[PDB]
Amino acid sequence: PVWKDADTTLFCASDAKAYETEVHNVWATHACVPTDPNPQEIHLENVTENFNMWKNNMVEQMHEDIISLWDQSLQPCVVIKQACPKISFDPIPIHYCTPAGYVILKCNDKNFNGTGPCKNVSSVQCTHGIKPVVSTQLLLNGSLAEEEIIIRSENLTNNAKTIIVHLNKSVEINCTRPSDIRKAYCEINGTKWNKVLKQVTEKLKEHFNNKTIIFQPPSGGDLEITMHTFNCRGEFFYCNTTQLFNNTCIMKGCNGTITLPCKIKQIINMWQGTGQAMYAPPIDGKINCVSNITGILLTRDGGANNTSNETFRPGGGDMRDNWRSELYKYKVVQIE
Numbered sequence: 001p002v003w004k005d006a007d008t009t010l011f012c013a014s015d016a017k018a019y020e021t022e023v024h025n026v027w028a029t030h031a032c033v034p035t036d037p038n039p040q041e042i043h044l045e046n047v048t049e050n051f052n053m054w055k056n057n058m059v060e061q062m063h064e065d066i067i068s069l070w071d072q073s074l075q076p077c078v079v080i081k082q083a084c085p086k087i088s089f090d091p092i093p094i095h096y097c098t099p100a101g102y103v104i105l106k107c108n109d110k111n112f113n114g115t116g117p118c119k120n121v122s123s124v125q126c127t128h129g130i131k132p133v134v135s136t137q138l139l140l141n142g143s144l145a146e147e148e149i150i151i152r153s154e155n156l157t158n159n160a161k162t163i164i165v166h167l168n169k170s171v172e173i174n175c176t177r178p179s180d181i182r183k184a185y186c187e188i189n190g191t192k193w194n195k196v197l198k199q200v201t202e203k204l205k206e207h208f209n210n211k212t213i214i215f216q217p218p219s220g221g222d223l224e225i226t227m228h229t230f231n232c233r234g235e236f237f238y239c240n241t242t243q244l245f246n247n248t249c250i251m252k253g254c255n256g257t258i259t260l261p262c263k264i265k266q267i268i269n270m271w272q273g274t275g276q277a278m279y280a281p282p283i284d285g286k287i288n289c290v291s292n293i294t295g296i297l298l299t300r301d302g303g304a305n306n307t308s309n310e311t312f313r314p315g316g317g318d319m320r321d322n323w324r325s326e327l328y329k330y331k332v333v334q335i336e
């Protein structure tokens with residue numbers, strides 16, 4: 001035993017083939033180390049420890065990882081004049097491990113909303129395979145809750161704090177652009193989507209005191225925040241998630257396949273801050289991705305403590321809460 005809450009400089013590990021150039025590998029061979037050959041996680045009997053993912057520093061430290069991954073690897077056309085070669089792109093799991101004198105604690109309490117104490121703690125040396133997808137409004141290719149749906153928020157009462165809806169059922173998404181080049185779409189199972197979405201509203205009313213929950217498309221911003229931007233094979237997609245957030249469809253004559261209009265923007269505003277950048281025309285041929293929806297990035301706006309309704313509009317932008325959704329059950333303690 002003996003430990004104390006502390007921080008340090010972490011290190012990473014990954015199953016990264018040294019021949020492939022799917023950039024996540026090419027970067028995880030020269031910055032990460034091989035995966036733990038034989039790894040054990042030791043449970044701690046009759047012990048309880050408090051966690052909180054919003055003041056946690058593993059998240060920050062991982063953000064400083066993906067930033068260098070994207071500034072090093074993928075390069076733009078545009079005083080900045082470069083060559084913009086088409087590259088390969090496919091994320092891979094990356095484990096996060098403590099050096100010497102420290103260890104990682106893991107909360108496997110079946111539910112657990114993130115901030116607070118555990119009860120079923122365990123001590124690991126590395127995290128686990130965590131895919132660094134950089135996406136907004138919808139969390140894709142993450143992990144899933146092993147019990148029920150959970151809403152994660154710092155201050156649930158606050159009105160500019162982002163919300164996170166960890167799902168217990170992965171909703172398949174399928175986005176394509178075959179053979180204007182950059183005119184794409186995304187097919188989603190409306191049946192699966194709205195079954196799970198009914199569930200999502202039930203939980204939101206469980207936290208918000210049997211109040212009428214309503215989903216609304218974004219107020220107004222740049223397409224980065226108001227339009228589901230993800231990265232597909234080195235292509236930056238933009239999907240008008242307006243048919244996803246409709247409270248009418250919660251019988252009814254809407255439950256089939258929800259095609260969604262998308263576009264492959266060349267001019268994007270970075271998520272690392274400071275400026276914009278332009279890339280290059282799409283690769284000829286079918287460009288598509290098949291990802292799992294697993295989390296949900298909402299920002300209910302305030303001004304309805306009195307009315308019997310609360311409006312929730314999709315959000316995101318600060319990719320930090322993309323990581324929080326995954327390193328919520330981990331804390332780095334030092335062997336004091």
Ligand SMILES: N=C(N)NCCCCC(=O)NCCN1C[C@H](NC(=O)C(=O)Nc2ccc(Cl)cc2)CCC12CCCCC2
Pocket residue numbers: 134135136224225229230231232236268269270271272273316317318319
């Ligand atoms: N200083 C300002 N300009 N403030 C006004 C904006 C406040 C709104 C805000 O603070 N929102 C959170 C942080 N923001 C996130 C934005 N995210 C993206 O553009 C993005 O994720 N694109 C993307 C997504 C997926 C892929 Cl695959 C590829 C690209 C940009 C940066 C910003 C930080 C603070 C300044 C601007 C807003």
Ligand SMILES: *[C@@H]1O[C@H](CO)[C@@H](O)[C@H](O)[C@H]1NC(C)=O
Pocket residue numbers: 108109110120
């Ligand atoms: C604690 O978590 C582990 C791993 O998730 C699982 O076996 C079970 O939920 C709990 N086990 C014990 C012995 O409490």
Ligand SMILES: *[C@@H]1O[C@H](CO)[C@@H](O)[C@H](O)[C@H]1NC(C)=O
Pocket residue numbers: 113114115116117151152153156
């Ligand atoms: C999370 O659980 C704690 C109890 O440990 C509670 O005080 C807090 O309000 C909960 N927050 C949410 C968003 O469920």
Ligand SMILES: *[C@@H]1O[C@H](CO)[C@@H](O)[C@H](O)[C@H]1NC(C)=O
Pocket residue numbers: 147148149168169199202
């Ligand atoms: C997800 O959680 C909800 C809680 O309301 C539950 O009703 C549902 O059966 C769960 N689904 C799965 C697949 O665990």
Ligand SMILES: *[C@@H]1O[C@H](CO)[C@@H](O)[C@H](O)[C@H]1NC(C)=O
Pocket residue numbers: 154155156157158
């Ligand atoms: C935010 O919500 C929590 C939940 O109980 C509350 O305890 C905390 O004090 C709130 N903070 C403020 C400043 O209201």
Ligand SMILES: *[C@@H]1O[C@H](CO)[C@@H](O)[C@H](O)[C@H]1NC(C)=O
Pocket residue numbers: 141169170290291292
């Ligand atoms: C999507 O989820 C299913 C189970 O819900 C899982 O078997 C599959 O591997 C996931 N796909 C990806 C790309 O992670």
Ligand SMILES: *[C@@H]1O[C@H](CO)[C@@H](O)[C@H](O)[C@H]1NC(C)=O
Pocket residue numbers: 174175176187290
């Ligand atoms: C994805 O959609 C394309 C065309 O819409 C289709 O050819 C492909 O089989 C689909 N894949 C999945 C897993 O739904």
Ligand SMILES: *[C@@H]1O[C@H](CO)[C@@H](O)[C@H](O)[C@H]1NC(C)=O
Pocket residue numbers: 188189190191192256257
């Ligand atoms: C949607 O999911 C259901 C499972 O409830 C399945 O039976 C149906 O074929 C799926 N439809 C589409 C278009 O994905």
Ligand SMILES: *[C@@H]1O[C@H](CO)[C@@H](O)[C@H](O)[C@H]1NC(C)=O
Pocket residue numbers: 205206207208209210
């Ligand atoms: C909501 O109302 C139902 C009955 O309509 C009740 O069983 C439940 O306790 C209520 N919950 C909240 C959070 O108001």
Ligand SMILES: *[C@@H]1O[C@H](CO)[C@@H](O)[C@H](O)[C@H]1NC(C)=O
Pocket residue numbers: 223226227240242
């Ligand atoms: C999304 O499509 C709707 C119509 O379905 C339109 O009113 C809205 O302006 C579109 N959003 C963007 C960002 O173009």
Ligand SMILES: *[C@@H]1O[C@H](CO)[C@@H](O)[C@H](O)[C@H]1NC(C)=O
Pocket residue numbers: 091133135140141230231232233289290291292
């Ligand atoms: C999710 O994972 C699948 C399979 O690993 C991959 O094809 C897809 O591109 C991924 N999605 C994103 C947004 O990276």
